[PDB]
């Protein structure tokens, strides 16, 4: 389903990319998108899928569009339009200076200080999950670890019941990797049905949990409304359930195939942080966009007011102009250039939490289970959307080579 080309689009700039089902998916999700960076593709293209929209394909353009909120507005940040339209998450659907205030609160909730405080549970939960897996010689890394690890730390932070996971996660999934089973608005509404009662409850009777702080927070001298708090909370939910979850499976899949990468991190632990950035560069996984607030001419292309452009965060780091041999994972790169956590005013507040959860896992897994591989005859499938994922990650290992701690 290709939509007819608007009049301002030169046919030479057409490249029908389906962000929800790219062509080379079998090769891997990052490889499927990287086709956008082949020599035949212009820097800025137009696709007729998902209703027609632009795509910036180069780190330089993505950054520029990310900085330029005057032109590129966060009002309608998701493709397809109906999706960007119905979404009203804060602070993601606002531009500066309105953004700034809401931003400041969200940070109170997820920032450094919170992570600093949760470190021991993070470390505690990782060791517990791993030790529990170790003797089995086999998991489903996606369901066995990638999901629970991050999610249970979030639920703890938010003060929400673990029982809610399956329900929440389904709703969250529908948002980034739409199934077809429910539209964005229906999905959005359902998560909202959930939150409303919770928030009400926490404005009356506050806790120390994330929701309670958001619900009772101050924005621009006055109290935040319920509707605003709902809209921030909606964001936190997706961040907690849908991000680190998918990241970990791509990294673990890479690790399960590269013995030598595992070794390096084993003998030279000082490299873990470095490694973590490189993997954040290589297995980057977010793709959103902005809407044109007016007619504007960008890098010799005319953009009409109301046009959506996808500015895949994913691609900056995979761009050869930014990183030599981009599909090559080298833990010793002098400069790891990525925009995995975004760029500009909307830079990811949860990046600290995410880095802590990644480093804990690599350090802790490698300690106990140094030697693992993907199960024989396992066919790993990726998934594309706003946030890309791995469908399942069947791992096997010999228990005899593990180490209990
Ligand atoms: C590996 C994991 C993660 C990645 C790759 C990621 C990526 C991003 C990206 C690219 C943006 C900006 C989107 C835009 O500019 O439209 C963003 C914003 C945001 N992320 Fe993350 N994120 C991750 C994890 C988290 C976590 C764990 C949380 C907290 C629960 C979170 C909370 C936020 C919030 C609150 C913002 C909005 C900041 C603002 O609009 O000023 N993220 N994230
Ligand atoms: C699309 C969907 C989810 C997100 N997100 C939330 C937290 N971190 C990233 C950003 C854009």
Q: Give the CATH number, domain containing residue 141.
A: 1.10.630.10
Contact 383, 177 (CB under 8 A): yes
The strands making up 288-292's β-sheet, listed across from edge to edge, are 44-47, 53-56, 308-311, 288-292, 72-73
CA dihedral 102, 105, 111, 116 (to 10 degrees): -170
Contact 273, 265 (CB under 8 A): no
**Helix-strand-coil percent breakdown of the chain, rounded to 5?**
50, 10, 35
Q: Tokens 């920032």 map to which residue?
A: 111
The dihedrals phi and psi of 73, each to the nearest 5 degrees, come to: -95, 145
Ligand 2 centre to CA of 159 (Å) is 20
Breaks in the chain after residues (C–N exceeding 2.5 Å): none
Total tally of structural domains belonging to the chain: 1
Rounded Cα gap, residues 182 and 205, in angstroms: 34
Burial of 374 (0-12, 13-18, 19+ CB in 10 A): middle
Residue 49 assigned as binding residue: no
Q: Ligand 2: which of 345, 353, 387 to mutate, most ligand atoms within 8 Å of CB?
A: 387
Q: Tokens 């594309």 map to which residue?
A: 384
Report the first-to-last Cα separation within the chain, whole angstroms.
54
Domain coverage including residue 208: 1-405
Q: What is the resolution of this structure in A?
A: 1.6
Q: How many residues does the chain have?
A: 405
Rounded Cα gap, residues 269 and 264, in angstroms: 8
Distances (CA, A) of 139 to 358, 371, 405: 19, 14, 19
What letters, b where the CB count within 10 A reaches 16 and e where it falls short, cover 87-109? bbbbbbbbbeeebebbbbbbbeb
Rounded Cα gap, residues 257 and 78, in angstroms: 33
218 forms beta bridges with 223
Active site residue ranges: 177, 242-243, 348-350
Segments in 332-394 forming alpha helices (H): 351-368
290 forms beta bridges with 309
DSSP state, residue 303: E
229 forms beta bridges with none
Rounded Cα gap, residues 141 and 133, in angstroms: 10
Rounded Cα gap, residues 106 and 237, in angstroms: 12
What letters, b where the CB count within 10 A reaches 16 and e where it falls short, cover 342-372? bbbbbebbbbbbbbbbbebbbebbbebbbeb
Write out residues with Cβ below 6 Å of ligand 1: 77, 91-92, 99, 103, 106, 110, 235-236, 239-240, 243-244, 247, 286, 288, 313, 340-342, 346, 348-350, 353-354
Closest Cα to atom 4, ligand 2: which residue? 239
Q: Tokens 């990287």 map to which residue?
A: 34
3-state SS string over 97-122?
CHHHHHHHHHHHHHCHHHHHHHHHHH
Write out residues with Cβ below 6 Å of ligand 2: 176, 235, 238-239, 243, 286, 288, 348, 350, 386-387
Ligand 2 atom closest to 238 (CA) = 6
Distances (CA, A) of 263 to 28, 176, 236, 266: 24, 34, 35, 5
Ligand with an atom nearest the CA of residue 247: 1
Tally DSSP H helices, then E strands, for the chain. Answer: 15, 14
Contact 46, 53 (CB under 8 A): yes
Distances (CA, A) of 239 to 46, 147, 158: 29, 13, 12
**Do you find a cis peptide bond into 80, omega within 30 degrees of 0?**
yes
Ligand 1 centre to CA of 394 (Å) is 28
Residues near 162 by beta carbon (within 8 Å), at least 6 away in sequence: 152, 155
Ligand 2 centre to CA of 111 (Å) is 16
Distances (CA, A) of 51 to 3, 5, 106, 294: 6, 10, 33, 19
Closest Cα to atom 3, ligand 1: which residue? 243
288 forms beta bridges with 311
Ligand 1 atom closest to 238 (CA) = 30
């Amino acid at each position: 389903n290709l939509a007819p080309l608007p009049p301002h689009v030169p046919e030479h700039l057409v490249f029908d990319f389906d962000m929800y089902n790219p062509s080379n998916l079998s090769a891997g999700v990052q490889e499927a998108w990287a086709v956008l960076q082949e020599s035949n593709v212009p820097d800025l293209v137009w696709t007729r899928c998902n209703g027609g929209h632009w795509i910036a394909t180069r780190g330089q353009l993505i950054r520029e569009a990310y900085e330029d909120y005057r032109h590129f507005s966060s009002e309608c940040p998701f493709i397809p339009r109906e999706a960007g339209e119905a979404y009203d998450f804060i602070p993601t659907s606002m531009d500066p200076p309105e953004q700034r205030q809401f931003r400041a609160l969200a940070n109170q909730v997820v920032g450094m200080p919170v992570v600093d405080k949760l470190e021991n549970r993070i470390q505690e939960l990782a060791c517990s999950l791993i030790e529990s897996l170790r003797p089995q010689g086999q998991c489903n890394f996606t369901e066995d670890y990638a999901e629970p690890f991050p999610i249970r730390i979030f639920m703890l932070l938010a003060g929400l019941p673990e029982e809610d996971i399956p329900h929440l996660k389904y709703l969250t999934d529908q948002m980034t990797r739409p199934d077809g089973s429910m539209t964005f608005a229906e999905a959005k509404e359902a998560l909202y049905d959930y939150l409303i009662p919770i928030i009400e409850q926490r404005r009356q009777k506050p806790g120390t949990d994330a929701i309670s702080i958001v619900a009772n927070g101050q924005v621009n001298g006055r109290p935040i409304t319920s509707d605003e708090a709902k809209r921030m909370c909606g964001l936190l939910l997706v961040g907690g359930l849908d991000t680190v979850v998918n990241f970990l499976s791509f990294s673990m899949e890479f690790l399960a195939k590269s013995p030598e990468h595992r070794q390096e991190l084993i003998e030279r632990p000082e490299r873990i942080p470095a490694a973590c950035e490189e993997l954040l560069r290589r297995f980057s996984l977010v793709a959103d966009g902005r809407i044109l607030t007016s007619d504007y001419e960008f890098h010799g292309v005319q953009l009409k007011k109301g046009d959506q452009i996808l500015l895949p965060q994913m691609l900056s780091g995979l761009d050869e102009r930014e990183n030599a041999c981009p599909m090559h994972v080298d833990f010793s790169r002098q400069k790891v250039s990525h925009t995995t956590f975004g760029h500009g005013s909307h830079l990811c507040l949860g990046q600290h939490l995410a880095r802590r959860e990644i480093i804990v896992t690599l350090k802790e897994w490698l300690t106990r289970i140094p030697d693992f591989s993907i199960a024989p005859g396992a066919q790993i499938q990726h998934k594309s959307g706003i946030v890309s994922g791995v469908q399942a990650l069947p791992l096997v290992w010999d228990p005899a080579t593990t180490k209990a701690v």
